[PDB]
Symmetry: C2
Subunit: 299 residues, 2 copies
Amino acid sequence: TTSSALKGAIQLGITHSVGSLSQKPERDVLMQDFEVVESIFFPSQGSSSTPGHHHGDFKFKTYAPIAFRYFREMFGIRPDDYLYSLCNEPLIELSLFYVSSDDEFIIKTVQHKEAEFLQTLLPGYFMNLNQNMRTLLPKFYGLYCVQADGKNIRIVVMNNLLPRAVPMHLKFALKGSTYKRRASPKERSKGVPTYKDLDFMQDMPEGILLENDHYTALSRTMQRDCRVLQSFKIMDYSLLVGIHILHMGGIPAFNSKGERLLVFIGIIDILQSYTVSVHRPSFYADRFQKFMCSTVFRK
Amino acid sequence: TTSSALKGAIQLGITHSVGSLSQKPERDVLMQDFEVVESIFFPSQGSSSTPGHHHGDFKFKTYAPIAFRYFREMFGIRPDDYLYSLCNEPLIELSLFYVSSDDEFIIKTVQHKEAEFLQTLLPGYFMNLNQNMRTLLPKFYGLYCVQADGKNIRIVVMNNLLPRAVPMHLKFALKGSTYKRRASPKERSKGVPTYKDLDFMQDMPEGILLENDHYTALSRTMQRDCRVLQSFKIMDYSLLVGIHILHMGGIPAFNSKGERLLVFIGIIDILQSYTVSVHRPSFYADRFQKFMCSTVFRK
């Protein structure tokens, strides 16, 4: 299990990266700061700025640091809370995946293509964050790379929509398409499984209700994230919806002859670099939206 | 005087450009919207969307429209107020310069190099506006081009720091350098002339005082606009300072054994595309700042 030697390099290097940054004084972000990549070397022998460790020698690459300082702040992620949740508490595997012990932060691994894509994406992302506070896209806290025995492991640190904190009764993974949009039998016999579009259309035919106030905003900030997504020629993103039926940081929703319930939603799998027509991601987004905003949620 | 045939094309075309835009529904800005250029043709014979006119036929090019919609809004420029001040009231020459009759809006002409530079500049500008509300840079309301008898006249519409509205007793044009920084005799015998750095250093040796509250902000948001300016490899910008000694939208300042007074400041001549060293605009900015923040204004 080199999994435990990654975990280590991850925790160690982030601390050096963000720890070093917090002593440095704060300053606005500039277009320059998005292309920045900074590395630091971690010998197992330890260095002058660097502790030894039982993991093999490795270099730790932290991408666009000032940009993510800024993003984390814009999300309400205090530096010490970030550093604690990630570096001072066991990381937790899953099934090339990790979670903080406190279940607030995800750490997925990404192909060099996905990563570099995200790098180019940062300006649009900035511009979204500052005009749509309500946006549903992934919250990217950080992009790092670990250089160990020739390999490059490349990670994105980001928010967990659906934390153990609250228990979820239904998982839904939506897209606005239908083909093979049914939860595999294998999936269908999990605890709370992630059902797909065909599942939602039978098992919740009356939909999800919302108050004409709460609704128009969701409709509004999805029209927005989609117009943003298409612009970047992205497709195959899904709208994850977690439902808690009630007996507090989400959306209050009703139920077709059902208990009041709180839904927890957000868009995923956004790093999809784009043979497809020029007019097609536009299409994917219109479908998506009109679906979520007419079949999944209703006023 | 084709000056009056420009004035016309300007007023006519803006109205069509912004007038058309205001019917269109509003939406966030995207990186895409900064490269956008849109044109429209104005025959003297008039068209289906286009009135006739006694100016020679011309095409009206409006650069990055959604971006400036957004900027104007971010500055508090209502569309109808913009359109009135510019298009429904005589423009006013000066000495390739114009002002609105109401003296709020400047219209300078710019070389194809300056204009295209500004086009590339828009992302950094956006990113500045959203992190430094207090920034002193030019306020760019719009970039347009008029195509008449082969020529391209290219205009920037922007804010007048120093409007007739308030009467100014001293003009100062600062830079942090000294060589040939003296108001020409010719200039020195104008009404209120624009004195330069050597002038300020003798005629106001005790400086300008401010309250430790008011000061630190100016210092702060200049360190910011300079760090921004250098990043874009700009130099030769000046800090225009208007002083009104008092017997209300500016800065309250004292005077070395003098009446309380209100200063009105902001940075100019920022479209300066950059043989100079890579380390030099950095230098220009540090000088500039330490000057304005140690010789011109004191706590």
